[PDB]
Design a protein around this ligand. Structure first.
Ligand SMILES: Nc1nc2c(ncn2[C@H]2CC[C@@H](COP(=O)(O)OP(=O)(O)OP(=O)(O)O)O2)c(=O)[nH]1
Ligand SMILES: Nc1nc2c(ncn2[C@H]2CC[C@@H](COP(=O)(O)OP(=O)(O)OP(=O)(O)O)O2)c(=O)[nH]1
Lengths: 605, 605
DNA sequence: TGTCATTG
RNA sequence: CCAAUGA
DNA sequence: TGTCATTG
RNA sequence: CCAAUGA
């Protein structure tokens, strides 16, 4: 007596008593049944698979040439919708993707609270391997594993592994396991406080990424085929007297006298040596355009081309990524040659929708301010709260004891020391990086961390905490476990120490930018009566008018990219600033710098 | 090099150049691809199959988890839509059904001109066998028969015979044959004038029946379970001194002295004999409720039960029918017993939607008026144009030479003679029917048809026309072929003669009621801003508010049933009268009598 | 591949 | 009588 | 299952 | 230096 399915749409008494039962349920699972048409090699959504306890699934379908139950999309769209008083926690496996396909097939704008188990078991152990439905079942909810023998999926929902088994069967089996497993995950997240952040940061952020993935990013093939010639034409320049792999550039041709070639870090007096410029430009027309101008998609509804990124997460730090052609990795603008300069990059081939401007918002010295908070460094806090240049002023402040109004441009080497200490690199490599001596660098380190005595007493505190705990937790309490902090090998433990400091600092940075993106979105879908993403317009208005409002476009770790209409681009920037500057209330003022333009090779206001 | 399919949605250049090509096409075929989900034993629409020449099909699909082409329903709904200047002739095989399923799955309210080949080849030869896609191919367009070998469907569209073959393949094969065949059918309909009536009566009427089939008819199980007891309780009454098949009622029990029993047509002085009342009531609780209360369907969107009839057509006369429980065949109201009377029928268990009233419109002596037109019977025409009682006045007029103001109730036997002559039954059976003598009946016939000399000279004219032609054509020119009018056997030829008169008279009746229903609908969907059938509300508003307007509910040969809202039930009745009374301009005034009530056991205004 | 009912 | 069902 | 580039 | 890709 194992696993029962209830074909809900198979009657009328059964269906109307079903949604009655359903419309007073707070928690319940959901799983799309997606089957392939005979090939016509296209997939299609053919049924929900709602469950809310035990081994009992309620399979909705989308019903053979009938005249009753033709309001089937209405019933789902009406149940998958917050309606004040109580909103529902809807556990969905590949939630990010599910949300998309649930819209780009049948115009259902899922508007509830969500609880993905795939990200719940990540949050438990961020150094875990990418969790499958199988893996989740194998660990949590050990029994009901026999329901997977023959299913054979190690990636996404039962939809994503469509194999012989009917859409309804697996969709039902998903909902059962997904529901009952998430209940055990919720129990563990509760045990270590992570349920609060999972529900009010990590899942809300997942929903934010879903919106971003639907929107995508504008891409001008025109202004990309511009750089395709600007770079290639100014590639083979003044080259008097065949570039290949490694063994090619002989130093026995001219005149330190080793091999490698990568470290051509002189080129000052000895010859022109314009090799690094060629090496960059060539490697910046191949990891940017030629893999990307193949994923470009003409979207005639918008009347432009766009690319559709796939957010990653499941990152040990907490920073969000993208698969394939990752738009985070396109190189920023830089000069060339012709005496006369020009500025190039593929960041000029990323465009707003016609009549709009792209909006960037960087946090500017966020990881610094996090350490300033955690490390109760008296003057380090007070230097940041003044709103003065946080490197001009930090140079004086106490490092060089006095200057304040005239303190040169040793700020450029004042930050180099600052970041060099928090990055946790040895005096040797820092000294080689600044262009000074290993000794005099070690002197500058000690003469900085003494003048800001908080930094070093913080690191020694958090490393000893990590040694006794076996893990370190960020400012939102998300733990990362490190077994290397016990290791006998000095290098391995030393590596574990600078792993611990990184995750508690630039993980807490990932935490604030999450809280920032969700608090923005909540505040963003209010004043603007014209509703949400490009998906909820090409898809939801397609089954439920100018382009007012702004949409989430790109996540750059500590920087956010939005795409706003020029009409109301000023009313949004206030929403972005005020929300990011108040995301978390710290002992240090969170400042942000916003830039507005026709790409993201643009100036500021 | 045979049969090419173009997966149109497989690109973007291909798709956008496709609908560009399409949006300037006047004629083109269409065929729904309908595949079954694994069982979840429900069918689903998965693609159009547009074609417009040769062996080249353009297969639309409804596309795998993508972000471009998610406006797919819009593109069809926008192409399947008249847009002024030019409207498109859309050839669809099982058009009546196709239209329904094209709406009760994906909210596409097909709004073009239509050309069904299944009804085009009926119109050619109404005594033909029910035409299949195979049969249409076998006769017209003899080649491309090999495209059917393995398909094996002998009923409906390639959808309706879903078997192993992919929805796209057969849907494409349909569109090719359907298009190219209909072109040959259009050529034959042109050759004999029938293309004009096919396009402006027969197909428009088919569309009218589609609307009716979507609407259905209200059915109160409450007021049906009323008669279920009223009839059954007043069934076994005063029965002093075991009813079975035939051999049971012996006349050797009491006291003309044969068998049969069916002809208990005395029961006057000899005993009560209340056997015909029991025989009727029992056979009127079994061919009306017990086969029908099983096809009743709760439709919660309307908040009532309804039944969904399936119109027939392909009738030698031209009158439209319904399959299964045919609502045309429910017996009208009649009295019973308790001294004290009550009136019963199942026509009291057919109801309007809450807040509405049912509207009936009978043509009253239509077949008479058709004969009055065709047979140029001078006074017969003039008797009908006065608007006086057309049987009180017809009794005098000339039959009894004079009376006019006092002419008794021999009108009841004046019409009996009238209908008896046009029905074409012998003096024998008419005489037995009126309760007079075969001789004195034959006298009354000759003394009527002499006083109205048109009737007999018309019949002798049209029978000699039919003898030389091999067929007779109605007032709209729809031919019916009769090989029996040559037959040596006197009975067979005599039968063929009264077949000829019937079809030219009560076929021309089917023609006017068609023209009536289409001219009503055209005038009906105008003033009423709130749009069309119950299908275009539970289905089209479901993918494109009170219940103002009126909808086509039942076709009773010469009578139409509508279902109108009480708010504006007076504004519609004017539309129905004026349209039916002007359907065709004859030499005789077409009068109509309308009845309004809470069922169709109701009174008039 | 008969005969009787119901509706028009 | 004719046309649709129906025993 | 190495080393060099890009982004933060 | 750490984390994501990438030769
Ligand atoms: N051949 C034939 N035609 C009929 C018969 N009954 C009606 N019709 C045709 C010709 C006139 C027209 C009237 O249809 P209705 O049944 O609405 O009218 P009725 O008042 O019941 O019939 P009638 O006019 O014979 O008195 O339909 C019938 O029994 N046989
Ligand atoms: N470990 C590490 N963290 C970095 C690195 N670059 C940036 N971060 C983190 C810490 C500060 C923050 C700044 O990100 P951005 O790249 O936007 O800032 P930047 O001005 O380019 O860098 P920086 O502050 O080091 O001068 O992100 C890096 O190379 N290593």
């Amino acid at each position: 007596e194992s696993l029962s399915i209830i074909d809900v749409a198979s009657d009328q008494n059964l269906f109307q008593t079903f949604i009655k039962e359903w419309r007073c349920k707070k928690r319940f699972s959901i799983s799309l049944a997606c089957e392939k048409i005979r090939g016509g090699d296209d997939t299609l959504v053919v049924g929900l698979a709602v469950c809310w306890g035990g081994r009992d699934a309620y399979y909705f379908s989308l019903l053979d040439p009938s005249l009753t139950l033709k309001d089937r999309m209405w019933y789902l769209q009406s149940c998958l919708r917050k309606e004040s008083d109580k909103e529902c926690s809807v556990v969905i496996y590949d939630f990010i993707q599910s949300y998309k396909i649930l819209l780009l097939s049948c115009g259902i704008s899922l508007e509830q609270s969500y609880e993905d188990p795939k990200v719940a078991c990540w949050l438990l152990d961020p150094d875990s391997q990418e969790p499958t439905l199988h893996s989740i079942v194998t660990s949590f909810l050990p029994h009901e594993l026999p329901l997977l023998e023959g299913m054979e999926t190690s990636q996404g929902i039962q939809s994503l592994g469509l194999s012989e088994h009917s859409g309804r069967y697996r969709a039902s089996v998903e909902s059962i396991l997904i529901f009952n497993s998430m209940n055990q995950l919720n129990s563990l997240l509760q045990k270590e406080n992570l349920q609060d952040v999972f529900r009010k940061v990590e899942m809300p952020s997942q929903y934010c990424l879903a919106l971003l993935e639907l929107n995508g990013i504008g891409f001008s093939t025109a202004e990309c085929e511009s750089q395709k010639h600007i770079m290639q034409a100014k590639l083979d320049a003044i080259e008097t007297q065949s570039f290949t792999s490694s063994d090619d550039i002989a130093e026995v041709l001219f005149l330190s006298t080793s091999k490698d070639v990568l470290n051509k870090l002189k080129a000052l007096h000895p010859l022109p040596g314009l090799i690094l410029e060629w090496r960059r430009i060539t490697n910046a027309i191949t990891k940017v355009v030629f893999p990307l101008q193949r994923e470009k998609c003409l979207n005639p509804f918008l009347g432009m081309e766009r690319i559709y990124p796939v957010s990653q997460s499941h990152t040990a730090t907490g920073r969000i990524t993208f698969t394939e052609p990752n738009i985070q990795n396109v190189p920023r603008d830089f000069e060339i040659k012709m005496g006369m300069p020009f500025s190039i990059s593929m960041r000029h081939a990323f465009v707003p929708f016609p009549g709009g401007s792209i909006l960037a918002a960087d946090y500017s010295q966020l990881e610094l301010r996090i350490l300033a908070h955690l490390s109760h460094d008296r003057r380090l806090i007070q230097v940041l709260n003044t709103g003065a240049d946080v490197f001009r002023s930090i140079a004086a402040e106490w490092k060089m004891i006095e200057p304040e109004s005239v303190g040169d441009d040793d700020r450029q080497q004042a930050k180099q020391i600052c970041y060099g200490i928090i990055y946790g690199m040895g005096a040797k490599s820092l000294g080689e990086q600044m262009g000074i001596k290993e000794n005099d660098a070690a002197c500058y380190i000690d003469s900085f961390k003494s003048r800001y005595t908080g930094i070093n007493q913080f690191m020694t505190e958090t490393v000893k905490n990590c040694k006794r705990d076996g893990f370190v937790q960020t400012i939102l309490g998300r733990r990362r476990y490190l077994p290397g902090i016990k290791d006998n090998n000095p290098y391995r433990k030393a590596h574990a120490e600078r792993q611990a400091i990184n995750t508690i600092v630039q993980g807490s940075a990932a935490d604030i930018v999450k809280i920032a993106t969700v608090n923005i979105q909540k505040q963003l879908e209010t004043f603007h009566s014209t509703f949400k993403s490009h998906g909820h317009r090409e898809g939801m208005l397609q089954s439920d008018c100018p382009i007012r409002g702004g949409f989430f476009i790109l996540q750059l770790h500590d920087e956010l990219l939005y795409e706003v209409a020029e009409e109301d681009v000023v009313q949004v920037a206030q929403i972005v600033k005020n929300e990011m500057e108040s995301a978390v209330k710290l002992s240090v003022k969170l400042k942000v710098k916003v830039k507005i333009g026709a790409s993201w090779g643009e100036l500021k206001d």
